[PDB]
Amino acid sequence: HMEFTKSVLFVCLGNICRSPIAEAVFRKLVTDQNISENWRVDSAATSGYEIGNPPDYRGQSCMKRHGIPMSHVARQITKEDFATFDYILCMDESNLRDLNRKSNQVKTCKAKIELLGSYDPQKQLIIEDPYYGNDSDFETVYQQCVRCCRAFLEKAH
Numbered sequence: 015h016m017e018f019t020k021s022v023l024f025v026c027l028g029n030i031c032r033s034p035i036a037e038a039v040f041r042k043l044v045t046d047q048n049i050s051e052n053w054r055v056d057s058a059a060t061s062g063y064e065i066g067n068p069p070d071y072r073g074q075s076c077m078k079r080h081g082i083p084m085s086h087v088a089r090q091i092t093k094e095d096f097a098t099f100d101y102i103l104c105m106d107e108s109n110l111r112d113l114n115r116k117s118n119q120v121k122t123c124k125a126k127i128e129l130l131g132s133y134d135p136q137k138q139l140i141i142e143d144p145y146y147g148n149d150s151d152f153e154t155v156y157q158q159c160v161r162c163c164r165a166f167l168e169k170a171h
């Protein structure tokens with residue numbers, strides 16, 4: 015059609031709390047703006063710990079509260095992910111180091127690997143792991159993902 019593709023992979027250690035939240039925050043954003051067709055959106059785990067697992071039910075509750083339904087099956091990052099993705103946006107410092115290790119074990123890294131939290135207007139660098147936190151901690155994570163994802167959509171680093 016002469017009437018009128020980009021990719022982002024959100025990453026944390028397990029792929030059950032934070033990255034699934036970001037992913038569904040970003041998908042909604044592109045979906046509301048009619049541009050989901052132009053975006054490839056996904057999330058993944060540096061580790062194998064959670065493979066096959068749905069998102070954390072505490073984080074799923076936070077998302078239901080905010081209208082945003084999460085359907086994601088935990089998977090571990092692959093070599094292809096680095097070759098196929100434009101951005102790989104991770105939560106914490108230990109994610110980023112682990113991603114960098116991974117990035118030197120592949121031929122082609124098309125991906126910019128970075129902190130999701132480096133798009134924050136409120137300047138909160140790290141999105142911290144709520145695995146041992148509570149619903150306040152999950153709500154804080156969600157809010158951070160909205161800010162960072164909105165800015166990142168606005169225009170990418």
Ligand SMILES: O=P(O)(O)Cc1ccccc1
Binds near residue numbers: 026027143145
């Ligand atoms: O999915 P996140 O946010 O990295 C937390 C997590 C969950 C399970 C195992 C390791 C880490």
